[PDB]
Amino acid sequence: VMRFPNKAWQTTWKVGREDPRRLIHAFKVGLSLTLASLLYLLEPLFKGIGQSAIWAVMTVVVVLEFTAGATLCKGLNRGLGTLLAGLLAFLVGYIANASDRVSQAIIIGAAVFFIGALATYMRFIPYIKKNYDYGLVIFLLTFNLITVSSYRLENVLKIAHDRVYTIAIGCAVCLLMSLLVFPNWSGEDLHNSTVYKLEGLAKSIEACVNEYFYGEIEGSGYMKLSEDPIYKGYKAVLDSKSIDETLALHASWEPRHSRYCHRFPWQQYVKVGAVLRQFGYTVVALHGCLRTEIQTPRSVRAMFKDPCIRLAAEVSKVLIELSNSIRNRRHCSPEILSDHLHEALQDLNTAIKSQPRLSLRPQLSKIAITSLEFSEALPFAAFASLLVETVAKLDLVIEEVEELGRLACF
Amino acid sequence: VMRFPNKAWQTTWKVGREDPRRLIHAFKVGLSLTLASLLYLLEPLFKGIGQSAIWAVMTVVVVLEFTAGATLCKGLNRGLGTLLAGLLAFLVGYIANASDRVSQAIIIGAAVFFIGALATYMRFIPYIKKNYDYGLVIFLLTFNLITVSSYRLENVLKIAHDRVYTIAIGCAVCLLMSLLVFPNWSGEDLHNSTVYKLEGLAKSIEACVNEYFYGEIEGSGYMKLSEDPIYKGYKAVLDSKSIDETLALHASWEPRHSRYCHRFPWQQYVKVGAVLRQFGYTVVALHGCLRTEIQTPRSVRAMFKDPCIRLAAEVSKVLIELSNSIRNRRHCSPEILSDHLHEALQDLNTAIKSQPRLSLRPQLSKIAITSLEFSEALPFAAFASLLVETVAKLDLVIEEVEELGRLACF
């Protein structure tokens, strides 16, 4: 326990060093909250609206999002959600307070119940559970907080359309401190997520072909994929579907057209993200192939250290020449795929041709498998087939990235 | 657009048919919200606390969670979060209102700012972004809503420790309508997530070995993995890490010991979930192997339709005999791994022995690969190696599930 809190300093700097913007965004949100709350003192003038200041702070806490685009997409989304909920609440309240006491009680109760049922239900729907989840958490909260105002009085509507002015001051501070201070344009954050994916995926292929051929120690059963920086690299391409999707959305939903880009192509980046997702499924197949129970003997696995190491180096070289292409906004070399790549594949083909033979509770199945003369190099043949499928996927990725370029300025 | 809303009826029943409990939980949350809000009318007696009723409703909306365990884990978590935030706010308020006007303004502003900075920052930390995210969203909201009370008056503390009684009525309704009405004990929801994983994974292996050998049509490049029910099966084992982790937590955090289970083993289920995650990485390697660009010829792929189909059938049979074992609470047959499995592997080995040879913009790399005489059956060799690694992983899964049984009553 002594080292738990201080050890946080190591978790905290990862957030710090991995990305410095998060610090700037935190200081943003802070200065925004404080500037909005400072309605505390300014009430004596400026129309005496300082009493409702809290709402400005809450608005900054709900609308302001890290990516200046996101703080506008969800901004408008939470806004209509709350406006729709408020309209429904005002409706149920006007229909309420209309019949006698027990009548209004039954109507309010049935409305709140029906609504909450529907609300949690929709919460279960996985279309609006991870995204637009705020669409029903806010919906329900606003609706109940307005149904409670129904009972009190109707001058509450007056005071609400008054305090809308300060909720607007809060929204304006959010908009400003998100777009015109040190914005994090989500578009151009999906213009760098791609280069990160490509760089990390090249790193992952190189590191995979290394930890297999110059094996740390051949035996598998050491730990979870998470600890090794290889998973650090290809888990992104594993799960970035939603990330890239929401990024492309927010970006398309961002105002800046100073790109001097004929047509804002923030969908082609999702195309490239999908191609990379497929390439990453392949790389994950690789990393699995290096942690199998039935494993090829190191010795028999040595005669190939020559060809596939070079082949993986060429795969990573082409992937990195693509990563430089999205980052520096230039189309790839026509001959990106090298004569060196084809030479490496020729060499690997030859290698395949040369020598073409190709208390404790113990594991019963492994014994069965290895007792059978299933080719000892069969796992390696699987590895090599996966590596060659990687080489093939390279062309698909190249075509998609070049279409991307042609789509953007590039 | 005409068919968009009605087509929701198809999205809605999936939630309905996939699991009926969600309906019962929705009606729970609804009856709870309404019963709490019904403080509206009961104020004339019962100590006249009906004015703050809203807070009971909000408490039911925040604490009540689908899994009776979760509504207690996050319940206590959100509670100390809000208590800590309230303590910090009362501190900054007492230190506030202590110096003169501009002094209190500067202190309140610096406190709110510093706090929001820290809060959004911590929000970025991915330890408390997906889980305990409510730990900082609530933290910040409560802290600001208490800093706004600081300015008003100190009798607010009186009224707050009064309205704590009705927030307690709300919490009690949540606790009751979550534990003693139709509870969804999260533990025993991680006792069925396992059987679902195993059943679906057997289905996935069978369906994979089928869509390759009796290929729909061999060519790949049809669509995203998501549409085919195979991804429906193995994406769970892909991403269930966090799901199983939080489930085991909540379960360990559940009160019922009527299990008559010597020791509540809600970690061994996570062990089994990890073994299944590895098995599922292998199955994902398979499904990749059936959607490769470089693909084995169907003809050359026919001579093996005999052995691996039987081998995959035996893999799925053993996986399903395990799924029945966790579901019916009995240890597996000592000889779960069949003589039929070993016979299938012998046959596949023989098969490997027999015939041991083993405007449009066109894709340049594929041409290079297939022009080279890389073995046409090399992709199939990779497929077979993956299938045999599956057979091997079977023993690991068997050992983990049997340890599980021995851990629980079983």
Task: Please give the full DSSP string across B295-357, using - where no structure is assigned.
Answer: ---HHHHHTTHHHHHHHHHHHHHHHHHHHHHHHTT-PPPTT-S-HHHHHHHHHHHHHHHSSTT
Runs of H (alpha helix) within B38-154: 39-42, 53-63, 70-95, 101-124, 133-152
Q: Chain B residues with CB inside 8 Å of A66's CB?
A: 124
How far apart are the CA of B264 and the nearest CA of chain A, in angstroms?
A: 23
- Cα A278 to chain centroid, rounded: 16
Structure tokens at B352: 């490997």
Q: Chain A contact for B97, CB < 8 A?
A: no
Distance, CA of B191 to CA of B273 (rounded, Å): 11
CB pairs under 8 A between A and B: 279
Q: A15 and B109 in contact by Cβ < 8 A?
A: no
Which of A259, A230, A264, A284 is closest to A393 using CA atoms? A284
Distance, CA of A220 to CA of A166 (rounded, Å): 62
Q: A358 and B358 in contact by Cβ < 8 A?
A: yes
Who contacts B13 (Cβ-Cβ below 8 Å, separation ≥6)? none
Q: B392 and A116 in contact by Cβ < 8 A?
A: no
Q: Chain A contact for B99, CB < 8 A?
A: no
**B positions 168-207 inside 8 Å of A (CB):** none
Q: A366 and B392 in contact by Cβ < 8 A?
A: yes
Q: Residue A40 is nearest to which of B23, B151, B353, comparing CB atoms?
A: B151
> Coil, helix or strand for A168?
helix
Distance, CA of B375 to CA of B384 (rounded, Å): 14
Q: Which domains are delineated in chain B?
A: 16-179 (no CATH), 193-407 (1.20.58)
Taken as a whole, chain B contains a residue count of: 410
Q: Chain B residues with CB inside 8 Å of A293's CB?
A: 389, 392-393, 395-396
Q: Residue A293 is nearest to which of B372, B373, B393, comparing CB atoms?
A: B393
Q: Chain A contact for B322, CB < 8 A?
A: no
Q: Chain A residues with CB inside 8 Å of B242's CB?
A: none
Q: Residue A125 is nearest to which of B15, B224, B374, comparing CB atoms?
A: B15
Q: Chain B contact for A222, CB < 8 A?
A: no
Q: Chain B contact for A372, CB < 8 A?
A: yes
Q: A148 and B57 in contact by Cβ < 8 A?
A: yes
Q: How was this structure determined?
A: cryo-EM
Distance, CA of B177 to CA of B245 (rounded, Å): 25
How far apart are the CA of B280 and the nearest CA of chain A, in angstroms?
A: 10
Q: Give one word for B329, left, alpha or beta, with left for phi > 0 and alpha for psi -120 to 50.
A: left
C-alpha distances in angstroms, B341 versus A9, A205, B336, B391? 52, 34, 10, 8
Distance, CA of A341 to CA of A310 (rounded, Å): 8
Q: Name the strand (E) or helix (H) holding B270.
A: helix B268-289
Q: Residue B120 is nearest to which of A11, A26, A101, comparing CB atoms?
A: A26
How far apart are the CA of A114 and the nearest CA of chain B, in angstroms?
A: 7
